[PDB]
Amino acid sequence: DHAARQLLDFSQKLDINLLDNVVNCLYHGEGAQQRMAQEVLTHLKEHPDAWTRVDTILEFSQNMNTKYYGLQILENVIKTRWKILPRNQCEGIKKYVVGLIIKTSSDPTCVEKEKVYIGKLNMILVQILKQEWPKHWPTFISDIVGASRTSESLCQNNMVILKLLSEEVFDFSSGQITQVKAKHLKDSMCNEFSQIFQLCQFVMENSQNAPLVHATLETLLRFLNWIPLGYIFETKLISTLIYKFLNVPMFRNVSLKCLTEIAGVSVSQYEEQFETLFTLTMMQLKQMLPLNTNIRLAYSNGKDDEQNFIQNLSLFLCTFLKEHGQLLEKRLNLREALMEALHYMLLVSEVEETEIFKICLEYWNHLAAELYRESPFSTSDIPPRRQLYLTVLSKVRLLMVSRMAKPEEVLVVENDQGEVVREFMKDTDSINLYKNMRETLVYLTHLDYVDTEIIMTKKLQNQVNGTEWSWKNLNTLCWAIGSISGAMHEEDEKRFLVTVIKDLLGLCEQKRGKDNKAIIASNIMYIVGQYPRFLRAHWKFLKTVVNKLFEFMHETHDGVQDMACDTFIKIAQKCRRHFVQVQVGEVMPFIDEILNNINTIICDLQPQQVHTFYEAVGYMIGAQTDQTVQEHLIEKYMLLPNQVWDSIIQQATKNVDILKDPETVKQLGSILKTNVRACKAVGHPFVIQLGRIYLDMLNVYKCLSENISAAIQANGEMVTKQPLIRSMRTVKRETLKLISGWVSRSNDPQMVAENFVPPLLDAVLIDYQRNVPAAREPEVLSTMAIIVNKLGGHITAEIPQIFDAVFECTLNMINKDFEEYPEHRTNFFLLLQAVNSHCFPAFLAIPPAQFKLVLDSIIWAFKHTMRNVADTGLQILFTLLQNVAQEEAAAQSFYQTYFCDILQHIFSVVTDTSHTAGLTMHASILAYMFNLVEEGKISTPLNPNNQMFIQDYVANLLKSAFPHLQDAQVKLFVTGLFSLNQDIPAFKEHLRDFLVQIKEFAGEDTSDLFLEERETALRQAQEEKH
Amino acid sequence: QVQFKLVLVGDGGTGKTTFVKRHLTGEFEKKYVATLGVEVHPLVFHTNRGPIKFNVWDTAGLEKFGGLRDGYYIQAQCAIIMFDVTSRVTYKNVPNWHRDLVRVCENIPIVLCGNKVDIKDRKVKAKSIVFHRKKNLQYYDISAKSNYNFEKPFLWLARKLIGDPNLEFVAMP
Ligand SMILES: Nc1nc2c(ncn2[C@@H]2O[C@H](COP(=O)(O)OP(=O)(O)OP(=O)(O)O)[C@@H](O)[C@H]2O)c(=O)[nH]1
Ligand SMILES: [Mg+2]
Question: Where is this site: Essential for GTP hydrolysis (chain B)?
């Protein structure tokens, strides 16, 4: 457009164009323009000069962007080096900061005139206060509780000030500000808060100014987070909030979220005020909400100011009712509102928005719990506490059954090879909701199965003739039925099932058309799968359900085939015992027939389903404990895949070109992906299978990894994204998942190392090297740490052969930045963690020249920004220092040629604002290193005592990289590293407490670190190591 | 059409850019390359009532590459806050990202996302995510790799801005 890289920004003043930058950053800038616009502005911030900002506003340009930017420039100067400005300049700022505040905050027409700018100046002023408020400028508060009582244009702004000052000292002190200083600033406000609460109580009782009061109110919610209890309960504050503000539209939400905080405290002392608060408010809600009004429609169509209130109320009720179930039951004169509130938590308990229904549910689960802890028995005598709730419990029991959540969270995702598969998400929020409703409902069933069974069946009778019918409805119900599984006695369950599964069967007759008969059959299959106990007793019935599943296998109608395999593997697991042993009134065990007729059950199944089906049978083959038999059940098991396998092996053994046909390579990926499943079930006894195809399975993996490499070279790396090199890429990877898989569940390490490892040494590792970098499968590293973590000592001797093949070549890919080959990054250091933590004796049997390249690699690890890789490195370092402290021989040798350097690297990481994540590992290691200095090392790092050397070495190392640190805070810090060197919780805090000091030029001398306070805290810790 | 300034913030390595990239080109970035200052890419989904355009302001998470932190928030219609369900740290700092944000824009539709919900070993257990409650925010459980609740953060914002709680993404031309 206009601006080019040549931009003047030194020894000159071009104000009129600075605007064209921000108006080109927050505006016109479509890309190339703002990418620079931000850079040129970014590099103008650290360019040392505070005074430079004066002209930005003095010669203002109506660009609140530039002014806000100039404000950041000033805030920067204050947050970094306020201690090195001579007093003449401090006042030059102070007087000017507050000056440009009043001359714009008192201006009545400054309503829309930048609510942001007005706020910034406040933050800047609060920043000055943080740098110095109790020290110098002690009048401040008194100068507000006197200057605010002038105009309301001032009073309204001084409130958003103290709101922020409170947020910076109490809410957001930790981390942003030093430790002992926070305590100074904290009890500094708590010291003269009585003088400002007078003005608060004042503006609420009198002032008619709406915005002002709203501020006085909003900016008060923050105080409730720390202020002494007295200012609340021991005064007419709880009262003035309900009577005067709770009912009005605008102060509606503000006052509610204040009460919600007050009610969150323990009731044990001010039992009277909590009582009055409850009733006084519960009635005030009756004058704001008809106790009958449809809440869901008040939310379905209501402005933001309305919607939020409903949520906050949901909070207040969940807060009070849960934290005062005591004061509400005993006090008989309060049962009045206890039910009037329980009802409110019931009307709002039916809004569409989940985030509100999770607040209510949170309480219902609590209530159902407390009444269950009392007596976990059904309605037989009479329950004591349940009386008050029996009525509500039924309304809740309905709420659950009415709005149950889908239990099985399923999603179809495409992976790296383009192929699409179905995943069942694990601990998501959605699949967590079902677990909270299930629990809530399974409580209110053990309290009365009748009432629940009534709602259940009445919902069902209406799901047939009662035309309460709907696809979503039939689903929602069968989620509720398959929910309270095993919640009742096996007898009351027997009639409940045959009642339901027969009405749905008759319902499956009425409803015609493959479309509706599917959704019905599905919700029957699922109900069954959720009731294992039932299926085990009635074999004849079970023998049918499975057979009818072998029927749905052939139903080409969408969804059905998937449900058939899902609902099948569900049963195959929980009832694995019945398929293997002979059944009474049966020729032979069932599993047998299933294997003799497997070529007809998967006749027309999608490949993805054939796999799932096998995995299902795998579990059944597993339940058969006896070896002799289980071995034949596998040779028959993997009978079809081994025909195709031997077919391709044979077909290819003559002219090895077969492995270049898109079809026959896709099939090999389908066979392995099956073996991976069967193995993922059968377990160790699956070895007989793996060992059969093993040598062949590797001979092909090798033949493919070559054709990939060759394809990558001669044709480039863009062949790695084409159909064929995708299928081959899967066959390769799966072979690894089968191997890495089985070993995970193997139980004979020696036999594994003797028979299965050697082939890999040649066919997998030596090939992982020959491969051109952009073809090396990283899964090879993972599938290696897995067999090391497993084998351990039995592969210790083969480590040299492993590293010699996959170490230096993999490391020459990831040492040129912190980005490329991400998978190879993580997989590598996971492998290193394996060897180090198990086969440590393998690091000793290798030359100190190789080991140096290894310890040098671990440092490279925890210097990553990859939060996971950076952690893997720290994990090894700590486990390294521990394994070394076993053999004093190589131990002392290690402390010699490394200790100092390591302690230097682990420090380059700590003082970096990009590794604060895995900080807990820092403090953990730094502590172990400094505790090891008080005894461990028995030699000499250099000339000198020995500890004394480190206490200085570290100091003179910090003082150098951070010269702006006075030799006091550096001495004190290094001291603490020995004091709380055995208290990692505080140690961790003492480090962050240092990372705060290095961010500011604390000046040559000031004595604001409060030595005598941070010192009697380190001696208070050093004396606690006893 | 109509476009809004979406502000995407959150701790580093969280997955903020990997997310935008998946919406922008359907590509999944497997590597971590900390975005500097702020990269702004336009994201367009169309609804049943016409196409919407989100000029996303993907910001920097790492303190080092902050840039003009709160300066990017100015003139924003909506916002997003993101953390990593595998790093308890990324969550712990949500109140902070929130703070500086609501100080600039004191009233805007805000979404809260937890990325990497596809990773088996979830660290930030879902039953402990309750910051958005009292702050009147909305929350989802996205997964930039699997696409779990892929568009739900946007779909939700689409409504809160237009005023139509019936808005739907379709995949039209
Ligand atoms: N396994 C898994 N990894 C993910 C997922 N989403 C994101 N990631 C990882 O997260 C990283 C994303 O990096 P970035 O987009 O730069 O994250 P960021 O927080 O925006 O970085 P900055 O903006 O510089 O602070 C990638 O390396 C991904 O591997 C996910 O859904 N599953
Ligand atoms: Mg980014």
Answer: 62
When computed from its CA atoms, the radius of gyration of chain B, rounded to whole angstroms, is 15
**Subunit contact A42:B71, Cβ cutoff 8 A:** no
Q: Is B47 in the pocket of ligand 1 (CB under 6 A)?
A: no
Q: Among A346, A254, A363, A262, which residue's Cα sits nearest to residue A309?
A: A254
Encode A349-376 in three state secondary structure: HHCCCHHHHHHHHHHHHHHHHHHHHHCC
Structural biology method used:
X-ray
Q: Which residues share a beta bridge with B46?
A: B51
Query: Measured on CA atoms in the order A295, A300, A301, A305, is the torsion positive or negative?
Result: positive
Among candidates B150, B30, B148, which has minimal Cα distance to A424?
B148
Which three-class secondary structure string do you get for A52-118?
A: HHHHHHHCCCCCHHHHHHHHHHHHHHHHHHCCCCCHHHHHHHHHHHHHHHHHHHCCCCCCCCCHHHH
Which of A45, A66, A116 to mutate to test binding with chain B, by most B CBs within 10 Å of its CB? A116
Q: Which residues contact B4 (CB under 8 A, 6 or more apart)?
A: B52, B53, B54, B55, B77, B78, B157, B161
The widest CA-to-CA distance across chain A, in whole angstroms, is 103
CB atoms within 10 A of CB A552: 20
Q: What is the DSSP string of A480-503?
A: HHTTSTTSS-HHHHHHHHHHHHHH
Q: A463 phi and psi, to 5 degrees?
A: -80, -10
CB of A172 less than 8 A from some CB of B = yes
CA separation for the pair A916, A919 (Å, rounded): 5
Q: Which domains does chain B have, with CATH numbers?
A: 1-173 (3.40.50.300)
User: What is the spatial distance between Cα A775 and Cα A778, in angstroms, rounded to a whole number?
Assistant: 9
Contact: A38, B37; criterion CB under 8 Å? yes
End-to-end alpha carbon distance in chain A: 70
Provide Rg for chain A, Cα atoms: 36
In angstroms, this model's resolution equals 3.3
Alpha-carbon span A765 to A1018, nearest angstrom: 53
- With beta carbons less than 8 A apart as the criterion, state whether A167 and A123 touch: no
| Ligand 1 atom 24, closest CA | B34
Q: Contacts of residue A867 in chain B, CB cutoff 8 Å?
A: 13, 84, 87
Nearest of B137, B133, B91 to residue B114 by alpha carbon: B91
